[PDB]
Amino acid sequence: ARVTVQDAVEKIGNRFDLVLVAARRARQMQVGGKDPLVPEENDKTTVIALREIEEGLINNQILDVRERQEQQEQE
């Protein structure tokens, strides 16, 4: 996502929750490592959050359900 993000906007729905679904995802892959799924084409953690929306992946439904997973692995 350098040219135009039109595919990844309407996936989550609007352009404001393309921020706080990608800000949260741009945060998770910057701190404690975290997995690069769709080939890390050089790029940076900026695009990656959005790039996971361009290939049928990251959403708010997948960031508030999988944060319960890192609360079932540390017991």
Binding site: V3, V19, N42, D43, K44
Partner: protein, 906 residues
């Protein structure tokens, strides 16, 4: 109370013990500094034993140093050893031996004392300024209350009955007056008093008293604190004590006031309990209280003080107002970091999202981006070691820069930001120089032009800042305009002429009767040098239409288009019909392609396609060998006839002037219509004697062909050159006005191909030196108009999921007798409905399907009619026209509204 997650704010009056709390120690002495060495004196306006020391965890005298003694309450120097920043928050006070009439509660009309005591304003001065007495308590001397008496008489009041009768003097009178005027009393004396003698505008003040009393004790204030019993003083850092350059001392007007004030308060104290000659005193309760009605607010009573240069002294008051306080210092006058500035230049190689940032600039911005992504890659051991490799201009520096600018966008700003497109984001790349580069299409979106201009250049930091700069502010969302349903980024100027030159029709150029085997053979037949961009020929085309669902539609056909036209079909992105480019495309009909490209397909290929027009526009613009020759400034053939037959039509009516078939006064205007007849009698022996001028024919012999003239083509393409401009250039200049307006006896005959008469220049002088003096206040008044308008409709947001009632406002097409502009298809567009679907959108694809019924009589649920708490319900509004979709819960409706009046307010 500890945690500082603030939620709400409340305001209230200034009690004595309250302001004392904020204060830590009285500002007893009125001293600044010992003009020997710069140390804030003992008990002076500056002092550490009150406000804290002059450094970090240190003192004045010099035993406690560096850090150790965290909050060690010293004495010899006198410092609670804390970090000096206390001098930005801590306060002192000045206890007045005489109560001092506060001003903001008094001379701010209609007086917060006046209609709180049932009184005017002139009065309260008299006793407080010092001439007369006033009565307080109800007893036995027949003087009741709030009575007024000039000195002399009072002798016979405490010499008749006496004992029960109060009446002191001064501001003090107003003090003790507010003490005993019970408020369970005053209140319930006006609810059965508005019973019959009401009247209709005599009761305009009787309702200004019911509000002010009711809202007072129920907040927990009570009115004793109106007049200032004790005076608060600011912290030392804020009022800046700073000795600049030349052993010389820099301080604003704050200090000059705070002092004198105390110089009287000390003359006062030493003359309250040291013999009180009460006439020599009225020199003091006056002059002291006359300087606090100068500190608090200088210019109110009547331009009281001046500086040392006959110009007013600024005050505590004007530290908020005067457009330049701490209110217009949190929004407007707000300096920002991580940015720069430079002059703007073209960039015809760029793709839309691309700016051309000055390498220099990028570097001195991204410093703390590079330092860290250098230490991480393993090229440096500290931040400072990198501070040398950067400045050394080491090569590896620029390496990291390319991968930092990779996936890290920018904000680009032009003042005035009349609306919101005045800022957009553009993904830059590197380009060396001092100069910044940009797109020539967004030229129009910005208030912009390449001639002597400048752009500040911010940088969005947090992951969010970047991505939301990409998600919203970016240029890629802003192809359609906010204010209306037209794209703002259109083929401006030059890009245009290329396409006209290209597409323009013909019958003879270089050979004809050709066919081609697709769009590819065409390009061969040009750049090599085997044909020209003309020649009407039947051409093979593989247009792919869209299926109902999509998209198994691959059509084939063979149609008539010129060499020029068809070349560009290459860049027309597969999914598009052909009849759009089939013609002599002016910017007018070029903007079509976009608008058609946008709604048939989408956003992702309109951007690619359109930017790729721009290149292809300039491509044949230059190649053309186009120019502005004095040949193509052609004059109408018989110009010196049309002026001449109408010049002797002046000499025929003046055979009738002083006599009588027309009178003396009306002369001025009878010929003005026949003058103005020739105005556009010649402009149609010009757009007819230059419109289709060719006549040199290859194919046997015929006449009709569009002109070879360079200028006209601009007026036919829409490059630049209005059908009024052209006249003035090589036709008729015509009618001008006066400073008043009345037109001149002889409008201009000549033009700018031929030479002007001195008179003829000297007249026009006005015409344009009025029309440009307007522009001295054009950018000024629009900005006053805009702001004002934004400030009413800014406290507003989108709110509910739905507002639900069948209601609205009429739309029935405009007919001013016989002249229409916008009827049904492009006015009622987007309006949300309420009858039959009802409660569904009327899209750009819809009032097509509501024109075919012979549609009449409409009512639509809109913004005024919004049964919606505080905001705009969204489902009872319309559409976000800065997009091709329904409006969304978020985009603040208000800001945009007033914004869209500033933009074309220019």
């Amino acid at each position: 109370t500890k945690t500082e997650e603030f939620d709400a704010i409340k305001i209230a009056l200034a009690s004595p013990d309250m302001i004392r709390s904020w204060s830590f120690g009285e500002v007893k002495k009125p001293e600044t500094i010992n003009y020997r060495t710069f140390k804030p004196e003992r008990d002076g306006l500056f002092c550490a034993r009150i406000f804290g020391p002059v450094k970090d965890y240190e003192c004045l005298c010099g035993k406690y140093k560096r850090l150790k003694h965290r909050g060690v309450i010293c004495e010899k120097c006198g410092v609670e050893v804390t970090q000096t920043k206390v001098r930005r928050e801590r306060m002192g006070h000045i206890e007045l031996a005489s109560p001092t009439a506060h001003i903001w509660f008094l001379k701010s009309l209609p007086s917060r004392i006046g209609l709180l005591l049932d009184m005017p304003l002139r009065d309260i001065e008299r006793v407080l300024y010092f001439e007369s007495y006033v009565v307080i308590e109800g007893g036995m001397t027949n003087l009741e209350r709030q009575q007024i008496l000039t000195e002399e008489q009072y002798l016979d009041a405490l010499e008749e009955f006496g004992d029960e009768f109060d009446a002191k003097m001064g501001a003090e009178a107003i003090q003790a007056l507010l003490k005993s005027m019970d408020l369970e009393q005053e209140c319930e004396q006006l609810r059965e008093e508005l019973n019959e003698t009401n009247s209709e505008t005599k009761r305009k003040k009787l309702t200004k008293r019911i509000k002010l009393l009711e809202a007072f004790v129920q907040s927990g204030n009570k009115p004793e604190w109106m007049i200032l019993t004790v005076l608060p003083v600011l912290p030392p850092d804020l009022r800046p004590l700073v000795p600049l350059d030349g052993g010389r001392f820099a301080t604003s007007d704050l200090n000059d006031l705070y002092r004198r004030v105390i110089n009287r308060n000390n003359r006062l104290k030493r003359l309250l309990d040291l013999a009180a000659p009460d006439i020599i005193v009225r020199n003091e309760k006056r002059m002291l209280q006359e300087a606090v009605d100068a500190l608090l607010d200088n210019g109110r009573r009547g331009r009281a003080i001046t500086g040392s240069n006959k110009r007013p002294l600024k005050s505590l008051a004007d530290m908020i107002k005067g457009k330049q306080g701490r209110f217009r210092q949190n929004l407007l006058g707000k300096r920002v970091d991580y940015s720069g500035r430079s002059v703007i230049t073209v960039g015809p190689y760029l793709r839309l999202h691309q700016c051309g940032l000055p390498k220099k600039m990028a570097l001195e911005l991204f410093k703390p981006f590079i330092y860290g992504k250098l230490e991480l890659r393993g090229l440096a051991t500290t931040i400072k070691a990198a501070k040398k490799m950067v400045e050394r201009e080491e090569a590896v520096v620029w390496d990291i820069l390319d991968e930092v600018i990779r996936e890290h966008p920018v904000l680009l700003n032009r003042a005035p930001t009349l609306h919101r497109l005045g800022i957009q984001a553009f993904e830059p790349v590197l380009i060396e120089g001092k100069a910044i580069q940009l797109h020539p299409l967004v030229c129009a979106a910005y208030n912009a032009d390449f001639d002597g201009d400048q752009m500040a250049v911010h940088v969005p930091l947090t992951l969010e800042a970047q991505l939301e700069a990409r998600a919203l502010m970016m240029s890629t969302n802003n192809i359609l305009s906010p204010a209306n349903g037209e794209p703002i980024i259109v083929p401006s100027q030059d890009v245009v002429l290329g396409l006209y030159y290209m597409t323009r029709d013909c019958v003879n150029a270089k050979g004809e009767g050709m066919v081609l085997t697709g769009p590819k053979e065409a390009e061969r037949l040009y750049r090599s040098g085997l044909a020209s961009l003309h020649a009407r020929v039947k051409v093979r085309i593989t247009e792919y239409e869209k299926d109902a669902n999509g998209e198994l539609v691959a059509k084939t056909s063979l149609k008539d288009t010129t060499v020029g036209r068809a070349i560009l079909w290459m860049i027309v992105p597969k999914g598009l019909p052909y009849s759009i480019v089939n013609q002599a495309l002016g910017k007018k009909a070029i903007s079509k392609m976009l608008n058609t490209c946008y709604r048939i397909l989408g956003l992702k290929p309109t951007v690619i396609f359109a930017d790729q027009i721009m290149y292809t526009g300039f491509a044949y613009a230059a190649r053309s060998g186009a120019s502005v020759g004095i040949d193509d400034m052609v004059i109408p053939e018989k110009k010196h006839e049309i002026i001449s037959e109408a010049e002797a039509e002046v000499a025929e009516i003046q055979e009738q002037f002083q006599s009588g078939l027309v009178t003396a006064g009306e002369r001025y205007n009878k010929v003005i219509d026949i003058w103005a007849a020739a105005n556009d009698r010649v402009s149609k022996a010009m757009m007819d004697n230059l419109q289709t001028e060719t006549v040199i024919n290859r194919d046997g012999q015929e006449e009709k062909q569009v002109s070879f003239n360079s200028i006209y083509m601009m007026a036919d393409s829409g490059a630049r050159g209005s059908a009024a401009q052209i006249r003035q250039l090589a036709g008729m200049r015509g009618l001008m006005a006066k400073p008043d307006g009345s037109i001149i006896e002889t409008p201009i005959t000549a033009n700018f191909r031929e030479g002007l008469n001195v008179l003829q220049y000297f007249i026009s002088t006005h015409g344009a030196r009025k029309g440009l003096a307007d522009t001295a206040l054009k950018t000024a008044n629009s900005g006053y108009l805009t702001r004002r308008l934004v400030d009413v409709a800014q406290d507003l947001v989108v709110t509910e999921d739905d507002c639900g009632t069948h209601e609205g406002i009429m739309m029935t097409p405009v007919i001013e007798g016989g002249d229409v502009k916008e009827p049904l298809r492009d006015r009622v567009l987007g309006r949300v409905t309420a009858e039959d679907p009802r409660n569904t959108l009327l899209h750009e694809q819809w009032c097509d399907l509501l024109e075919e019924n012979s549609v009449d009589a409409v009512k639509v649920r809109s913004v005024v009619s919004c049964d919606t708490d505080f905001g705009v319900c969204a489902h009872c509004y319309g559409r976000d026209l800065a997009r091709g979709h329904i409006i969304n819960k978020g985009e603040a409706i208000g800001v945009i509204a007033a914004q869209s009046i500033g933009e074309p307010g220019t």
